[PDB]
Each structure stands twice: as C-alpha cells, then as structure tokens.
C-alpha cells in the first residue's frame, strides 16, 4: 500500500445525534499518486441488513504529497426521515470510515457507537417500550467507541 | 479584498464536452497568514433571467494557505441535466462563476460566458420552437468557455 492510516481521532465525542461528525485523520503517503483519495463515512443503522446504511458524505482529497498528511473529515449526521420509528437510532449502531483510490476501497475503519436519550434507561425497558417511546432527537447523544477500531485493508492496484 | 489576490485563471480543458469536469488552474498570492481555509466554488448559471437555474457544481476547501504565490487546479463536476424542462436549455450561451470565500464571506467572483453547441445543429438557423423541441444528445454537446473575457468582482471582507 502507498497509503497507511496512522491515526484517527473523533474531535467531538460524545456529541448530539444531529451534530456533524469530525474525524481528524493522519496518514502517510509512501509514493506519488496520480489521483485523489476518496474518503467516505457510512452510518450503519441495523446489524442484520444493509438496508439501513446511509452514506453520510464522501470527500475527495488531493493531490497527495509524500510523507505525513493530516486533515479533518466533517460529515453530515444521519437522516431520520425514513425510519419506521425514531428509537431505531438508540442503542448500539455502527460507523464506517473508508478510503478508496480510483473507485477501489483500500481501508475501512469501523466503530461501534452508543446512543442514549436524556431521561431514558434502555436497559430497564422491554422491547415494545423501546419501539414505542417518543424520541426527542435533540436529547439524543452519540458516543463513538473510538479506542476500539475494527480495521480492514484490501489490496488494490494503485498506479501500477 | 487585501489578504488574497488572484493573479491568474486558466481553463485547462477548453473547448470540452458538456459532461466533462471543469478544470481551472488558479494562481493567487497570499500576503499574510490566515486562520482558516479558502473556500472556492463553481456555479453554473443556467438562465440569464432568474437564479432558479443556478447549480453549485462543487466547493473546494484549501488550506492552510502559505504566504506568497499559490497555484492549484480546481476540478469541478459538470452540471446536472435531470431537472431541465428540456435538454436544449444547455445550448447557446450560459454562464459559469468562479468564486472564493473566507469564513463564509465571498471576496472575489470571476464570471465567464460559455458557448454551447451540439454536433450537427446550427442554432442560428433554427427558430425558437425548433430549439425547444430538438432531441439533444448530451454526448455531442461541447462547451467553450470564453476565458479571455472574465468579469471580475471584488468584495471587501473582514479577514482575521
């Protein structure tokens, strides 16, 4: 790999559900590259299907110099308009930070995210109560578990 | 607009296909250090009568800005044709505006007329009804930016 991610920090954590995500990313670029890097943040709403994935934002970054590079990827919050009930945002969800080069993903960093609403204790509620509770999104906070990334790397062709 | 001054603007790829991304090579000088990024934007202006048909093509954040001469290439996506009442709206003269802002305050705008023609059609020999109804193959539409006659507007802003 020409590109190795050295560090990912979530700048604003915990945060309101609706606050934009800010990921400060440091990486090394080991050789010259013709094209931009394409970074993406994906909200993963359900553990069982991809049906509730949302691509939050996609950022093209370049041209890329040799050596250390550091930037902030600020991404939109998730859209709540399409959910069967708002309580689907609560409890553990997932966020995936990925980078691709010339449309081929080469790294993915996944995080679990805790989500809680002021005034509610989800551990004390049965499933029907969670489904039906009135959610005030302005009282919902996320907490990204950012010290435990799942990191996956895929070999790609680069400029070869 | 004292801290940043645009020195040169070149269109790299001209004429080009309507669907080809725009490439603007821009040289400027930065006379003093700046806290924040410059925000560049390209705007497609589809109607000369109203702003309903404006499309922001892309917005590029660049920084940090070193003192002195800076040069970069602003690549922007082409216009979207999905929302037009008819495809021939892309033909004839339209406008593109290159602009830069600092901390959400626009300080310069560089505007260009753009000629647009389709292979096989002579618009000067067509009446208005013909132009409205002709089948446009976007793949055969070329734009030609009139890059020697920029309209340049400068707006005093506060900087830091």
């Amino acid at each position: 790999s020409i590109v190795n991610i050295l560090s990912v920090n979530v700048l604003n954590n915990p945060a309101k559900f609706s606050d934009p995500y800010k990921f400060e990313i440091t990486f090394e670029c080991l050789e010259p590259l013709k094209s931009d890097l394409e970074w993406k943040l994906t909200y993963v709403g359900s553990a069982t299907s991809q049906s509730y994935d949302q691509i939050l934002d996609t950022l093209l970054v370049g041209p890329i110099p040799i050596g250390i590079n550091k930037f902030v990827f600020e991404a939109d919050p998730p859209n709540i308009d399409l959910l069967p009930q708002l309580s689907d945002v609560l409890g553990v969800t997932v966020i995936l930070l990925s980078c691709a080069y010339e449309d081929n993903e080469f790294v993915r960093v996944g995080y679990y995210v805790n989500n809680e609403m002021e005034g509610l204790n989800l551990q004390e509620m049965d499933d029907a109560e969670i489904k039906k509770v009135k959610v005030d999104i302005s009282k919902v906070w996320r907490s990204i578990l950012a010290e435990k990334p799942r990191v996956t790397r895929f070999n790609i062709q680069w400029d070869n | 607009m004292s801290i940043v001054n645009i020195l040169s603007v070149n269109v790299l790829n001209n004429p080009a296909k309507f669907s080809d991304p725009y490439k603007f090579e821009i040289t400027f000088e930065c006379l003093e250090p700046l806290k924040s990024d410059l925000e560049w934007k390209l705007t497609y202006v589809g109607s000369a009568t109203s702003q309903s048909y404006d499309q922001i093509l892309d917005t590029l954040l660049v920084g940090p800005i070193p003192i002195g001469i800076n040069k970069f290439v602003f690549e922007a996506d082409p216009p979207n044709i999905d929302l037009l009442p008819q495809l021939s709206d892309v033909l004839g003269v339209t406008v593109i505006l290159l602009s830069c802002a600092y901390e959400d305050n626009e300080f310069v705008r560089v505007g260009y007329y753009v000629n647009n023609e389709m292979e096989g059609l002579n618009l000067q020999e067509m009446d208005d009804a013909e132009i409205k109804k002709v089948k446009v193959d976007i793949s055969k539409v070329w734009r030609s930016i009139l890059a020697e006659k920029p309209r340049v507007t400068r707006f005093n802003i506060q900087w830091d």
Binding site: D36, T58, G62 | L60, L61, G63
Partner: peptide, 6 residues
C-alpha cells in the same frame, strides 16, 4: 491539501 465533498 484540497478537499471537495461529493
């Protein structure tokens, strides 16, 4: 470093 959102 130049950053463009899609």
């Amino acid at each position: 470093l130049a950053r463009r959102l899609r």
